[PDB]
């Protein structure tokens, strides 16, 4: 879709304003480098004429040598200078875009971040954003040097001969003509082969992730003839594309070769006298044919490098396709109020017609009506997809609701999220330890806490049970997504920090859901004794032991449908009893 391609490259060229004095110096230095090329080719052409025509000894030519050596030094300086300026252009764009991405991703909060795998956000922040470096560092600076340097060459050859300058300039319209003429036969070979080369692209990794399936079926020897056949197909199918993409590259090497060969013949023949045009009747000199011959390869070098950096435009329009889509998502955030709750005691939460809605606008929990007084341990049960966790997120301020959810008599949306989250602590379904070391994770809530309270905090959560089992003790590294702590060990440390600070509410997504048998006993009784200190709301899948809790709040498809003490609805014959039967049907 070239309608969006106009908007994508407009996005790419809009994000470049951050480093705009770097893309201006890189354009100025591409003009200077085109002037040091002409001076370099003018001093060699004049030195070579003196030695060859006038037979001037090299010791008399110390002034043109000094200038010639000087241009080579300045020519190398503005190549070193231009490489560095180009990096700064692309760095300050990647840095500023990545900050925007990590701000829209932090304001969106945990409700939206879970929409995608955690490695599918690190593709967007690491790979996609860094894929845009070479479009600003190398492609954009080169497209400036690809129009200035060739035009400086012609403007500097035209005073000497207009036929030498016409050879180089005559190929200026011919190259795009044939390159597009070929390039539109390479969009038919790249169209009928696009689907078949996307299927064959990932065929190896597909057969490589299903080796256990091929082992148990005895097809391991019959997939070598599939890799053999899907590689002959891939090769023969991509050589058709390449057979035309190397003609486009070869159009420029044809006119580079033709122009160097025409300058040589035109000048060589005009010195002899076979040709009598091109000059201004002043005669053609040897230094005017050397100048047009040193500058004939240099006329096409900017257009040749640009053909190598052109791929950087494709992988930067690819990364702009997903960065523009991400940055223009219309998702709406919960309102951060200014009201503050200074009760510092169990809150009297209660709600009416919440209609909790995801960031994308979809509704998650239907009409919700409940009144949980201060200090009352309350539980939620149900089946998957009923939005039991969507109510816990909505109480943490991660979700937006259309109705009244008044905490201690104050509307939640009007309550400032910063102050609301010191009276709140919770245990997640999946323990996430954002710190590095185990001691820091417990002290994540309180940056610096009294050691006796710390000691009492982690002893009470039964994390000291396996502290001797750890290599370095408390101050041990809990590596990211690594099994330094198993699911059992890493769940009691989540509870350890949940109970470290007093809270006016305590949510529990599903502590001890995927836990091991022994840890489940250890983690669950510590929370169970901790749900008697402040108003607690818990979501559980083990319906077997809930007699102590105050209510049940079983809900299905977004609405609380039964409420009451576990004794009441244990055998009432309702869906909770049916749901309880489902739990016992497995083991």
């Amino acid at each position: 879709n070239k309608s969006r391609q106009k908007e994508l490259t407009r996005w790419l060229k809009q994000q470049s304003v951050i480093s705009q004095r770097w893309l201006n110096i890189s354009r100025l230095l591409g003009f200077v480098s085109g002037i040091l090329i002409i001076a370099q080719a003018w001093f060699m052409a004049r030195i070579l004429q003196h030695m060859i025509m006038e037979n001037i000894p090299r010791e008399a030519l110390l002034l043109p040598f000094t200038l010639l050596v000087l241009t080579f030094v300045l020519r190398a300086w503005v190549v070193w200078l231009r490489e560095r300026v180009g990096y700064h252009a692309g760095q300050h764009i990647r840095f500023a875009i990545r900050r925007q991405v990590l701000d829209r991703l932090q304001q969106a909060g945990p409700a939206w971040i879970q929409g995608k795998p955690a490695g599918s956000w690190a593709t967007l922040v690491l790979e996609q954003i860094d894929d845009m470096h070479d479009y600003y560092a190398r492609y954009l600076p080169q497209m400036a040097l690809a129009v200035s340097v060739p035009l400086l060459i012609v403007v500097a050859i035209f005073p000497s001969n207009w036929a030498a300058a016409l050879i180089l300039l005559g190929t200026a319209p011919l190259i795009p003509l044939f390159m597009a003429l070929v390039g539109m036969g390479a969009a038919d070979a790249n169209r009928r082969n696009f689907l078949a080369l996307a299927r064959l692209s990932g065929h190896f990794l597909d057969r490589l992730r299903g080796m256990e399936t091929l082992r148990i079926f005895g097809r391991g020897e019959a997939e070598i003839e599939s890799i053999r056949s899907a590689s002959e197909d891939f090769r023969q199918r991509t050589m058709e594309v390449l057979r035309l993409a190397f003609l486009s590259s070869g159009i420029l090497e044809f006119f580079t070769s033709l122009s160097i060969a025409l300058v040589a013949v035109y000048f060589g023949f005009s010195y002899l006298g076979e040709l009598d045009f091109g000059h201004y009747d002043t005669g053609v000199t040897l230094a005017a044919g050397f100048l047009a011959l040193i500058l004939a390869p240099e006329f096409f070098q900017p257009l040749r490098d640009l053909g190598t950096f052109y791929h950087a435009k494709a992988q930067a329009v690819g990364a702009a396709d997903s960065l523009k889509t991400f940055m223009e998502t219309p998702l709406a955030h919960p309102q951060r109020g200014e009201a503050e709750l200074a009760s510092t005691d169990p809150v009297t939460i209660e709600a009416e017609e919440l209609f909790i809605t995801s960031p994308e606008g979809k509704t998650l929990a239907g009409p919700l009506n409940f009144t949980l007084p201060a200090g009352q341990r309350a539980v939620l049960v149900g089946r998957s997809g009923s939005g039991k966790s969507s109510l816990l997120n909505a109480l943490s301020g991660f979700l937006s609701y259309q109705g009244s959810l008044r905490i201690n008599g104050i509307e939640l949306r009007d309550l400032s999220p910063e102050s609301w989250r010191k009276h709140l602590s919770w245990v997640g379904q999946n323990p996430q330890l954002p710190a590095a070391t185990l001691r820091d994770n417990v002290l994540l809530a309180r940056p610096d806490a009294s050691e006796q309270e710390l000691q009492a905090a982690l002893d009470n959560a039964w994390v000291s049970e396996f502290l001797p089992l750890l290599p370095q003790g408390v101050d041990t590294p809990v590596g990211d997504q690594a099994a330094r702590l198993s699911v059992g060990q890493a769940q009691r440390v989540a509870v350890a920090r949940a109970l470290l600070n007093p809270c006016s509410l305590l949510l529990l997504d599903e502590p001890a859901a995927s836990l091991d048998a022994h840890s489940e006993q250890r983690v669950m009784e510590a929370l169970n004794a901790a749900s008697l200190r402040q108003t607690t709301l818990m979501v559980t899948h083990q319906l077997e032991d809930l007699a102590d809790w105050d209510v049940i709040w079983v809900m299905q498809d977004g609405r609380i449908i039964e409420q009451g003490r576990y004794a009441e609805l244990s055998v009432a014959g309702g869906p909770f009893a049916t749901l309880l039967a489902h739990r016992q049907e497995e083991i």
């Binding site: 955690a118 992730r209 050589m239 989540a494």
Partner: protein
């Protein structure tokens, strides 16, 4: 550099297309150097001759040489690109057949240490990098060397001193510059690949743990620690570009130094000839054009450290000992497999709890035996019965013969298995079910697709529909009917079911257990599980605790007596 030997031996298969593509990169690059050094000489010789020597000077031989050196420079580059990329896709096919054949015998256990999907994305990439050894290393380095030695030999016919100083400068920067810039950028290449992984792990730890960081008030403290890693990561990319800046600048000064030396030295004389007219421009224009051979050579040695690095990851993963070996007995497949186990390790001991008395269970020819373990359990029978690894204790017999007696040709033929993780291959439905029985006709595939209940997958040329990645996806309970379809197509006397109903809703799992009843009516079905929905039809139910069988017996027989299964049936 010795890590590349196993793969450089893979190049011997295509040594004529690979060596042709290097010759075509020399002829192309000699014709570029010879087009600008014959033009430079032709202008000097024509100017010296002048109109006085219009007839004495032979202009049609150089004029026919600039036309020939311009056609081989143009067509040669086209054919060098075609040969070098064709010969690269043929090596890639070899590199994939090679790494697949070695990774198969060590499939389940040889890759168990690493995380499949994170290890297999590198394996695909490290094979895509050993493909680069020819285009990105061998061709630039070999092509540069024998272009230097062909212009040096050629220029030595005019002057030895001038050919050796021009060739000596080119050769001294072929053999010193690429290694000296790999050592300078070795410290920042280790730092760069370290800060990138440090930022990647801090970014995912900041994103996954966003729920906890906001509520525990540390999101903006772990954010400034994440920016400081980027600031350090961007400062290691600056130092790397400050070195490619110096590489390109220094490379320009050497090719500049080679021009002042050709101007200054060749004016004193080329050979005995003092004051040579046209032979000064032959040298200075050769030196002006010859340093095109050395343009890609500094980055070709940089990429050799990555082709070596990947040559080690691929070599260590594929140079591992397979867990099991299969004798080449060629035993014919026999029907009515009866499975007998003696003292076999059900689950590997937890931190070596004790000498686990192996489960000595006997299964008759047609018996459907269900193993009812606790959550976690961890039956390896599906792993030991398919010979994913040899059992350290006890012996396993298939039809009163040891399991190790069967070759893989027949072991995979007398056992049919449905796993928990069913794999949806990317191929078509026809190819994704012929995995089971290759010889089956298309009609038989369509029948079993209805006899299992996958009639929704037969719509609008369903058998030709692409599945898996880049195609329509099957959800839980759709795959489980596809895994069973394969097991029914690849009919084997003994059927192992890992957990045929896990995560299935009660409405659809009922169809799965009943499907077993009539489809696998005469089959030595052995189904381990954790659920109770339809164990009544399973003969000889086994209840399982930590590797020791508590009780066995038919559902009615086992329920009538008070037992472990009795508490499971009623309550917890």
């Amino acid at each position: 550099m010795r890590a590349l030997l196993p793969y450089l031996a893979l190049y011997k298969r295509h040594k004529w297309m690979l060596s042709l593509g290097i010759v075509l990169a020399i002829v192309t690059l000699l014709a570029s150097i010879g087009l600008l050094t014959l033009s430079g000489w032709f202008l000097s010789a024509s100017a010296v001759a002048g109109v006085a020597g219009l007839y004495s000077f032979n202009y049609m031989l150089p004029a026919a040489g600039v036309r020939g050196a311009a056609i081989t420079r143009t067509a040669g580059r086209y054919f060098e690109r075609l040969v070098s990329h064709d010969a690269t896709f043929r090596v890639l096919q070899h590199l994939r057949i090679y790494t697949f054949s070695k990774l198969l015998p060590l499939s389940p256990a040889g890759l168990a240490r690493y995380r499949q999907g994170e290890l297999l994305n590198r394996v695909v990439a490290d094979v895509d990098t050993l493909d680069h050894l020819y285009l990105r290393v061998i061709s630039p380095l070999v092509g540069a060397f024998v272009v230097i030695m062909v212009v040096t030999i050629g220029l030595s016919f005019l002057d030895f001193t001038l050919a050796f100083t021009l060739g000596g400068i080119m050769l001294l920067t072929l053999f010193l510059m690429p290694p000296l810039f790999y050592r300078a950028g070795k410290s920042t290449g280790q730092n760069l690949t370290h800060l990138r992984g440090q930022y990647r792990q801090q970014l995912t730890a900041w994103l996954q743990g966003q729920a906890e960081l906001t509520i525990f008030g540390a999101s903006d403290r772990y954010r400034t620690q994440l920016e400081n890693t980027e600031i350090q990561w961007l400062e290691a990319q600056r130092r790397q570009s400050e070195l490619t800046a110096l590489s390109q600048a220094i490379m320009l000064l050497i090719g500049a130094l080679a021009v002042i030396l050709m101007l200054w030295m060749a004016s004193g004389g080329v050979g005995g000839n003092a004051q040579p007219g046209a032979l000064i421009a032959l040298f200075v224009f050769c030196a002006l054009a010859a340093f095109e051979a050395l343009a890609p050579v500094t980055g070709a040695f940089q990429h050799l450290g990555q082709v070596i690095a990947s040559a080690v990851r691929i070599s260590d993963l594929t140079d591992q000992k397979p867990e099991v070996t299969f004798p080449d007995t060629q035993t014919r497949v026999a029907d009515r497999v009866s499975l007998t186990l003696r003292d076999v390790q059900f689950t590997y001991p937890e931190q070596s709890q004790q000498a686990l008395k192996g489960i000595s269970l006997q299964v008759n020819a047609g018996e459907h035996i269900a193993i009812l373990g606790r959550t976690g359990g961890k039956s390896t029978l599906l792993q030991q019965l398919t010979r994913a690894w040899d059992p350290q204790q006890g012996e396993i017999l298939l039809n009163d013969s040891p399991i190790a007696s069967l070759n893989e040709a027949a072991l995979r033929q007398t056992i049919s298995v449905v796993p928990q993780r069913v794999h949806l291959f990317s191929a078509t439905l026809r190819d994704n079910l012929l995995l089971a029985s290759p010889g089956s006709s298309d009609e038989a595939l369509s029948e079993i697709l209805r006899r299992v209940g996958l009639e929704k997958l037969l719509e609008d040329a369903g058998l030709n529909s692409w599945l898996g990645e880049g195609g329509r996806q099957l959800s839980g309970g759709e795959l489980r009917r596809l895994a069973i379809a394969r097991a029914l197509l690849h009919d084997a006397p003994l059927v192992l079911l890992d957990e045929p109903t896990e995560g299935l809703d009660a409405t659809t799992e009922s169809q799965i257990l009943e499907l077993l009843a009539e489809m696998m009516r005469e089959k030595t079905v052995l189904m381990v599980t954790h659920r109770l929905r339809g164990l009544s039809r399973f003969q000889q139910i086994i209840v399982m605790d930590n590797g020791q069988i508590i009780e066995q017996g038919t559902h009615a027989e086992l329920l009538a007596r008070q037992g472990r299964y009795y508490q499971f049936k009623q309550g917890l």
